[PDB]
Amino acid sequence: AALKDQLIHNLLKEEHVPQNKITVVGVGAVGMACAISILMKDLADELALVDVMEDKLKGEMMDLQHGSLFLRTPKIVSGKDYSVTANSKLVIITAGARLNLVQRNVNIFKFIIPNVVKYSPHCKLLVVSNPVDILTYVAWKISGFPKNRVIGSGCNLDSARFRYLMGERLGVHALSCHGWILGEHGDSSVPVWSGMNVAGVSLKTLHPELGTDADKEQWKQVHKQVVDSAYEVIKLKGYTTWAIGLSVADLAESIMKNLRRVHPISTMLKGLYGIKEDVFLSVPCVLGQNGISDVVKVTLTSEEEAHLKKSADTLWGIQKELQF
Amino acid sequence: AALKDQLIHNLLKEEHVPQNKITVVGVGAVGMACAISILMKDLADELALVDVMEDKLKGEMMDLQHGSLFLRTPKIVSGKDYSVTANSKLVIITAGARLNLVQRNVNIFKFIIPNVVKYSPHCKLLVVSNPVDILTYVAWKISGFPKNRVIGSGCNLDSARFRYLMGERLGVHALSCHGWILGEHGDSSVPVWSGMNVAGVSLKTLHPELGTDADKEQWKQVHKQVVDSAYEVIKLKGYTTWAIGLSVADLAESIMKNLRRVHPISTMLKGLYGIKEDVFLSVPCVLGQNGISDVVKVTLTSEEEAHLKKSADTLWGIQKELQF
Amino acid sequence: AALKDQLIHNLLKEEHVPQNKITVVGVGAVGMACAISILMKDLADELALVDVMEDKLKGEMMDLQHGSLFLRTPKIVSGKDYSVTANSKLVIITAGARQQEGESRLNLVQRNVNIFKFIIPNVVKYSPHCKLLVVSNPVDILTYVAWKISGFPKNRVIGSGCNLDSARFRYLMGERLGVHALSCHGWILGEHGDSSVPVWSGMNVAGVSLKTLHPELGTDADKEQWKQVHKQVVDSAYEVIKLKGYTTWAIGLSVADLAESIMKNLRRVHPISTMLKGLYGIKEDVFLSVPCVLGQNGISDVVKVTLTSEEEAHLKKSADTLWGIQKELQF
Amino acid sequence: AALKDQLIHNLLKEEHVPQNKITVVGVGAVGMACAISILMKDLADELALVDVMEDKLKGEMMDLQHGSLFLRTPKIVSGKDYSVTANSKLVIITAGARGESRLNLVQRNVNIFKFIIPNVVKYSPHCKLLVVSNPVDILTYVAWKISGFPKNRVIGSGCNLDSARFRYLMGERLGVHALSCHGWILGEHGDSSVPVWSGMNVAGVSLKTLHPELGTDADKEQWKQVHKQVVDSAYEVIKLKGYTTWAIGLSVADLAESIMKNLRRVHPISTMLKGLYGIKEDVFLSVPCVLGQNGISDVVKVTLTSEEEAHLKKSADTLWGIQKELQF
Numbered sequence A, B: 001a002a003l004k005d006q007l008i009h010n011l012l013k014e015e016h017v018p019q020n021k022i023t024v025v026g027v028g029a030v031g032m033a034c035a036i037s038i039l040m041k042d043l044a045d046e047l048a049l050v051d052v053m054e055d056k057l058k059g060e061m062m063d064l065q066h067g068s069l070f071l072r073t074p075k076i077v078s079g080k081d082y083s084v085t086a087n088s089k090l091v092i093i094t095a096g097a098r099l100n101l102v103q104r105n106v107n108i109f110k111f112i113i114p115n116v117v118k119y120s121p122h123c124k125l126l127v128v129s130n131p132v133d134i135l136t137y138v139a140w141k142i143s144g145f146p147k148n149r150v151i152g153s154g155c156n157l158d159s160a161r162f163r164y165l166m167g168e169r170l171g172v173h174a175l176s177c178h179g180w181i182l183g184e185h186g187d188s189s190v191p192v193w194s195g196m197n198v199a200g201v202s203l204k205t206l207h208p209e210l211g212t213d214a215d216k217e218q219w220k221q222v223h224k225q226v227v228d229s230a231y232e233v234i235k236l237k238g239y240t241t242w243a244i245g246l247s248v249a250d251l252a253e254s255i256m257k258n259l260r261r262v263h264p265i266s267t268m269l270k271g272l273y274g275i276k277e278d279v280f281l282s283v284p285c286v287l288g289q290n291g292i293s294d295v296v297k298v299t300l301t302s303e304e305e306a307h308l309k310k311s312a313d314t315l316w317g318i319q320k321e322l323q324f
Numbered sequence C: 001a002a003l004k005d006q007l008i009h010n011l012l013k014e015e016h017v018p019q020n021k022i023t024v025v026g027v028g029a030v031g032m033a034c035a036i037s038i039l040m041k042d043l044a045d046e047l048a049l050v051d052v053m054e055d056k057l058k059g060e061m062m063d064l065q066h067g068s069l070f071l072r073t074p075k076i077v078s079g080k081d082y083s084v085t086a087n088s089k090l091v092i093i094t095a096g097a098r099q100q101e102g103e104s105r106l107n108l109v110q111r112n113v114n115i116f117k118f119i120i121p122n123v124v125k126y127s128p129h130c131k132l133l134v135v136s137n138p139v140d141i142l143t144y145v146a147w148k149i150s151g152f153p154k155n156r157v158i159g160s161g162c163n164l165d166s167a168r169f170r171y172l173m174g175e176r177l178g179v180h181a182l183s184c185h186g187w188i189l190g191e192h193g194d195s196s197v198p199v200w201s202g203m204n205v206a207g208v209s210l211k212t213l214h215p216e217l218g219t220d221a222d223k224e225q226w227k228q229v230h231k232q233v234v235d236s237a238y239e240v241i242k243l244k245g246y247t248t249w250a251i252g253l254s255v256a257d258l259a260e261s262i263m264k265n266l267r268r269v270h271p272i273s274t275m276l277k278g279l280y281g282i283k284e285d286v287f288l289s290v291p292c293v294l295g296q297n298g299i300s301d302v303v304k305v306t307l308t309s310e311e312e313a314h315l316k317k318s319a320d321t322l323w324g325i326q327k328e329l330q331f
Numbered sequence D: 001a002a003l004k005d006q007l008i009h010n011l012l013k014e015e016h017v018p019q020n021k022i023t024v025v026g027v028g029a030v031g032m033a034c035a036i037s038i039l040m041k042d043l044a045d046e047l048a049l050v051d052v053m054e055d056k057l058k059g060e061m062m063d064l065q066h067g068s069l070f071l072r073t074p075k076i077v078s079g080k081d082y083s084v085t086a087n088s089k090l091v092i093i094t095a096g097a098r099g100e101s102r103l104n105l106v107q108r109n110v111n112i113f114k115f116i117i118p119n120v121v122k123y124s125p126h127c128k129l130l131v132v133s134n135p136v137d138i139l140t141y142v143a144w145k146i147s148g149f150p151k152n153r154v155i156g157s158g159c160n161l162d163s164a165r166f167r168y169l170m171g172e173r174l175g176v177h178a179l180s181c182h183g184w185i186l187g188e189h190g191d192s193s194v195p196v197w198s199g200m201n202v203a204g205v206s207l208k209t210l211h212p213e214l215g216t217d218a219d220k221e222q223w224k225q226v227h228k229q230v231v232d233s234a235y236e237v238i239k240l241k242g243y244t245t246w247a248i249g250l251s252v253a254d255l256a257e258s259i260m261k262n263l264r265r266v267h268p269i270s271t272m273l274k275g276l277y278g279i280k281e282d283v284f285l286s287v288p289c290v291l292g293q294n295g296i297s298d299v300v301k302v303t304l305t306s307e308e309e310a311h312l313k314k315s316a317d318t319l320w321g322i323q324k325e326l327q328f
C-alpha cells in the first residue's frame, strides 16, 4: 500500500463544503494586503484569489501556501476561473483598470460580478475599487443582490486615518479618539465636526471654531491631510497597501463574526438623508452576517445635509451615463 | 418615536441562524473554563450554555455577557430548555453525576443527548465527562450519530501534560517536545516511548532503557506523574479546570477551522489496532469540520498492542452492564 | 551522560531575567480569572501568583502549567514568599477579607488595610518599579491605601474603579440599541458602586449624542427610563452574586484589557480610579474614576469631562465620604 | 487655552523608553512582509524601519501608521539615521544588493553590512541580530564577525522557511495540516541543504521505518523530490511573481515571537556551529536551536548518517573557502 495508507487509515468519505470561505478578486497591492490581513486574523477556513494575471496569481497563491505552518487557514486556492470562488461568504473586489475610465471598470465588473454571483449566490460583496461609491453601485446593479449584501469600503480607511491623525494631536491612541468622515469617498467627503470626541467630550463644544477658517488650530487641515494622504503615500512608495488592507479585514471581521459593529462604509441610501437617487454614500452602518442591516441617522448641520445631497446628485449624474 | 428609532434606521428585517454556534453542556468548573477559553479564542459567533442548575446557569451567562466589550462573540445564551442550543456546529458535554456511578451518568446522557440531537441534528459531539471513553460510547449509542461526529477528549490533555513535563526535563517548550499517550484514558493509558523526540531525534534510540524499570533516569515515573496529576491538583485546589479547558478549546479550533490537525482523542476504533469491539480509545486522530475522518496507524510493540486490546475488553465489559 | 546532555548541547549559561512579568496577588475567583485572561492575551512572558493559601496556590499554578502547550507564556510561578514576584512590570491586587456576620463594613475595610500593610511593602520590595493595579473592594479606598503604603508616585498606582461598570453600561446600552457594545459609548465615573455617575451627555453611537436626540435621557421624567440602565449597572454585581455566588469572567476580562494598555504602552482612555485631588473640583486626597490615558508609566493624563453642576456635586460628596472613611483608618 | 490642554490634563512627563522595540533593516518586499507580520502578531510596542531609499521609507512608515486603529503597536518610526533604531531588543537585517559572480555579489553585500551592522551595534548594543539577506549562512557570519557580538546573539533565518515549506508539502501528500507533519532541513541554506529523512514523522510514527526507501532513489513515491521541490520553490515563485514575501515574513515573525516571549521553541536556524556536528571552521549552518530572549541558547544534536555528516562538512568547506576570500 502507498505510504499514506500505511500511516493513515481513512474512516470517512470527505465532502469539502467550505464554511467560512472568503475570496479576494485581484491580487494587486491592495488585494494581497487584504489577503494577508485576513489570513493573519484567522477569519476564513478557506481563501480564494482570482485574477486574469495567471502567473502572478499562481505565485501569490504559492507564496501564501508556503506559510501554512504559521497560519490557521487550512486551504488557499487560486485560478482565472471563478469555480475556485464557489460558496464564498464574502467576496472582496479589488479589481480595476489602469479619458474617463469608469465604463471600462464597468466593463470589468460586467464580466467579474456575474461570474461571482454564479459561484457564490448567497455571498456578501465588498467593493474596494475606486471610484468606490460608483463601482459599488455598479456591482449592486449587475449582481441582482438586495442592497444589504453589497458594501463599499467607502470612508472606512479615511475615518481610520482621521482618528490616527486626531490621536497624534491629542496624544492618545486612535482607538480612544472618535471621529467620522462620511459622504462621498475622496475630496468631497464630510468631516463631521460635531461628532469628534474623547471619552464623550465633544471637541466642537469645547472649541466652537473647530474645523472653520477662523480655527487657530487649523483642524480643517486634518481633514485636508486625510483627503491627500493617499496621493502623498502614492507619491512616496507608488501605491498604498497595508492600511487599506487592514481596514478591509476589520470589515470582514464584523461580517464573518456577525459583530454588528458600526463602520463608516458605503451603502445604498436612497430613502435616507434626504436622498432620492439610487447611489451609495458612507454613513455609520451596522455591519454583520447579513451585510448592512441598519444605519445610524446622524444629526447633520443644514450645509452638511446639502453637501450629502450634492454628492448624491454628483454620483448619479455620472451613473446616468454608464451602460450595463 | 423611540430613541432607538431616532438613532437607527432599520434597513433589513432578518432572521437568526448562527453560522458558528458552540454549546457547552454543564456550567461547572470544567464547562465554564471551556467556555471562557472558547470565547477568548474567537471560535464562535454564538455560545449557548445549558445545565439544570438554573440560577448558576443564568449567573454564569450574565457574567460572560458583561464582558462583551472585550470579546468578539456577539451572542451568548443559556437555558434549561435545549432549544437554546439549536443549530450548533459543536456541542461539548461536561455533564455528569459503587459503580453504577456510570449508570447514573448513563441516565443523565439518556436525557441530555436526545435533547442535544433534536435541536442540532448535524452537530459534532465532544464528550469530556469522565469516565470519558465509556461516556463517549454512550452518547454515540444514544445519539445515533455516525462515529466521525462523536468525539471524546480522551488522552488529549494527558499528552499535553506529558509534553509539558518532558520540556521541563529537557529545558525546551512543550510545543517543541513530542510524545503521545494513547488508548484508555486514566491509569491504563499507554506512553508510546518510541515516539518521543525533539526535532525528530528519537529519545528511545539515544537511550534504549527509556521508560523501563532499569531506566536510571526513571522516565516511567513521568507517565505515572501524568496519570496522577488530576488527583494531585484536585488534592490541592478541589478540581481541575484551566488546563482541560485550554485543551478542549484547542480541539474546538481544529473542528471550527477544519484544520485537519492530528490530536490524541478517543474515537470508535472497531476494526483498527486489532480491536473488534464497539469501544472508544485515544489514537492519533485527524480532526476537522467533519469530526474525526482519519486515524494515524501507530506502530505499536506487541506489548503495546495487547495493552490496547486489554483496554478494549475491559471497556466492553463495562459497557455490557449498562441499561439503555 | 544524561539524556538531556546527549540530546541537547548547551551553549549559554542562562541568568534568567523576566522582561514582561506580571504578578497576580490572590488566587480566588477574581485573581484566577485575571490570570487566565492575561495568559490568553499573551501579555506577559512570566506570570507569578501569591496568596496565603498554599495548597490552593500550588493547585492553580500546576493547573495553568499543564496548559502550557496551548499558551505563549513560558514561565508560570507561585509561592507564599514574594521573592517569586521580583521584577514585575505589573502587580494586580485582588486580596481581601470576606466579611463575617457580624463585623461592620468599616472594620472589614480595616482588616483589608491590615492585609495591604503586609502585602504592599512586600510587593514594593521585590518590584520597586512595578505598576500597581488594585481590584479589591472597596476599590477607590483600597487603592488610596495601596498608594499611601507603597510610596509610589501616583501615576503608578491605579484602581480598576468604574472600568467594568462602564463596559457593563455599554453592553446594556447595545442591548437596547441593537448594536455591539464596542460601538456604544458611555461613561460611568466617580465613585465605584451605588454613587457612580452615568455621564449622560457623553453617551453616543457614531458620535451622535443620545442626549441631544432625547433630552429626557436619564431624567426622572424620561419615558424610556434610561436611568434604570445605570441602576442595572450598579446592581449587576449583586444580581450575579445572587445567581452564582460571586463574579469572575467579566471583571477578569476588564482587568486584562487594562493590563494590555499598560504592557503595550497604548495610551488608550479607560474609566479607572486615580488620585485626582486638585482636579474635577476635588480638594481631598481621594481616588475617583475619570477617563485616564493608560500606558507603560501608568496613568499619564486624565481627560477633563465637562460635568454638570449636579454631577460635580455628586463627585465632591463622594470625595467627602471617602476622605471621611480614610481618616478613620489605622495605617 | 489650546484644545488638547482644554481636553486633557497632563500629569506625567516623558521618560519614553521602548520596552519591546523591533527594528527591521530594509523596506523591500521581505522587510515590509516581516514588518506587517510582526505588527499583526503584536510582538513589539515600537517598530522602526531603516533604509537608504528615503522616499520609499517615509511612504512605508506612513502606510503602516494609517492602520494604527487596527493595531496594538502604538509607535512606528523610520529614517536613514540609525538613531531611530536605538534600544532595539531585536534587529532584523534584510538589506542587500541584487556574470557578476557569487563572490563579487557577496563582497558588495559585505560592504553594506560594514556600514549597517556597526550602526546597528552603536545604537542597540544588547540587541539580538537576525539576518535574512542571502546568502544567509555567509551574511550571518559577516554580521557576527563585524558586530563583535557573542554567537548566541547573531542568528540567520537559514532553513527555517524551508523546513516549513517541507512540512507543508508533506502535509499535502498526507492529507493533514503542516502543523501535524514533522521534518527537518538542516545544513547550508538552499540546494546543499539536507532533508533529514529519519526525523520525518506524524504522531511520532517514523515515516522512514514504515517506508524504508524514504529519501532514496529506489523510491516509487519519489519522496526525495519533495526536498527538491522545497529547494526550488523559492525561484519558482520568483519566476511567477518576481520575488517572494508573505512566507518569509511569516517565518521571520515566528522566530521573533520565540525571541520576544522567550519561548525556547526549537527552530531550524543558522548558528555558528564550529565544534558541533563535526565542523572545524568558523561557519554558520542551520541546526535545531532553542531560541529565547538571549538568542540561541542551546542546540539539539541530531543523529546524522555518515553521508549526512559528509554533506555538512562539505558545506562548511565551501562556506569557509568563500569567507576566506572576503574583505572586511
Ligand SMILES: COc1cc(OC[C@@H](O)CO)c(Cl)cc1NC(=O)CSc1ccc(C(=O)O)cn1
Pocket (backbone or CB within 6 Å): A025, A026, A027, A028, A031, A050, A051, A052, A053, A094, A095, A096, A097, A098, A104, A105, A107, A108, A109, A111, A112
Ligand atoms: C484590467 O482588467 C482586470 C483587472 C483586474 O484587477 C487588476 C488589479 O487590480 C489586480 O491584479 C482583474 Cl482582477 C480582472 C480584470 N479583467 C477581467 O476580469 C476580464 S474582463 C475585462 C473587461 C474590460 C477590460 C478593459 O477594458 O481593460 C479588461 N478585462
Ligand SMILES: COc1cc(OC[C@@H](O)CO)c(Cl)cc1NC(=O)CSc1ccc(C(=O)O)cn1
Pocket (backbone or CB within 6 Å): B025, B026, B027, B028, B031, B050, B051, B052, B053, B094, B095, B096, B097, B104, B107, B108, B111, B112
Ligand atoms: C446531576 O445531573 C446533571 C448534571 C449536569 O452537570 C453537572 C455539572 O457537571 C455541571 O453543573 C447537567 Cl448539565 C445536567 C444534569 N441532569 C439532567 O439533565 C436531567 S437528567 C438526570 C438523570 C439522573 C440524575 C441523577 O441521578 O443525579 C440527574 N439528572
Ligand SMILES: COc1cc(OC[C@@H](O)CO)c(Cl)cc1NC(=O)CSc1ccc(C(=O)O)cn1
Pocket (backbone or CB within 6 Å): C025, C026, C027, C028, C029, C031, C050, C051, C052, C094, C095, C096, C097, C111, C112, C114, C115, C116, C118, C119
Ligand atoms: C485573609 O487575608 C488574606 C487574603 C488574601 O486573598 C484572599 C482572596 O481574596 C484571594 O484568595 C491574600 Cl492573597 C492574602 C491574605 N493575607 C495576608 O497576606 C497576611 S496579612 C493579614 C492581615 C489581616 C488578616 C485578617 O484580618 O484576616 C489576614 N492576613
Ligand SMILES: COc1cc(OC[C@@H](O)CO)c(Cl)cc1NC(=O)CSc1ccc(C(=O)O)cn1
Pocket (backbone or CB within 6 Å): D025, D026, D027, D028, D029, D031, D050, D051, D052, D053, D094, D095, D096, D097, D108, D109, D111, D112, D115, D116
Ligand atoms: C544597496 O545598499 C543597501 C540596500 C538596503 O536594502 C535594500 C533592500 O533590501 C530593501 O530596499 C539597505 Cl536597508 C541599505 C543599503 N545601503 C547602505 O546602508 C549604505 S552602505 C552601501 C555600501 C555599498 C553599496 C553597493 O554595493 O552599491 C550600497 N550601500
Ligand SMILES: O=C(O)COc1cc(F)cc(-c2ccc(C(=O)O)cn2)c1
Pocket (backbone or CB within 6 Å): A026, A027, A028, A029, A030, A031, A093, A094, A095, A096, A128, A129, A130, A157, A229, A230, A231, A240, A244
Ligand atoms: O491594488 C491594485 O491592484 C489596484 O489599485 C487599487 C484597487 C483597490 F481596490 C483599491 C485601491 C485604493 C483605495 C484607497 C486608497 C487610499 O485611500 O490610500 C488607495 N488605493 C487601489
Ligand SMILES: O=C(O)COc1cc(F)cc(-c2ccc(C(=O)O)cn2)c1
Pocket (backbone or CB within 6 Å): B026, B027, B028, B029, B030, B031, B093, B094, B095, B096, B127, B128, B129, B130, B157, B229, B230, B240, B244
Ligand atoms: O466540572 C464539572 O462540571 C464536573 O466534572 C468534570 C466534567 C468533565 F467533563 C470533565 C472533568 C475532568 C476531566 C479530566 C480532568 C483531569 O485530567 O485533570 C479533570 N476533570 C470533570
Ligand SMILES: O=C(O)COc1cc(F)cc(-c2ccc(C(=O)O)cn2)c1
Pocket (backbone or CB within 6 Å): C026, C027, C028, C029, C030, C031, C093, C094, C095, C096, C135, C136, C137, C164, C236, C237, C238, C247, C251
Ligand atoms: O475573588 C476573590 O478573591 C475576592 O473577591 C474580590 C476581589 C477583587 F479583587 C475584586 C472583586 C470584585 C470586583 C468587582 C465586582 C463586580 O463589579 O462584579 C465583583 N468582584 C472581588
Ligand SMILES: O=C(O)COc1cc(F)cc(-c2ccc(C(=O)O)cn2)c1
Pocket (backbone or CB within 6 Å): D026, D027, D028, D029, D030, D031, D093, D094, D095, D096, D131, D132, D133, D134, D161, D233, D234, D235, D243, D244, D248
Ligand atoms: O526583499 C528585499 O528587500 C531584497 O531581497 C531579499 C532580502 C532578504 F533579506 C531575503 C530575501 C529572500 C530570502 C529567501 C527567499 C525564499 O526562500 O523564498 C526569498 N527572498 C530577499
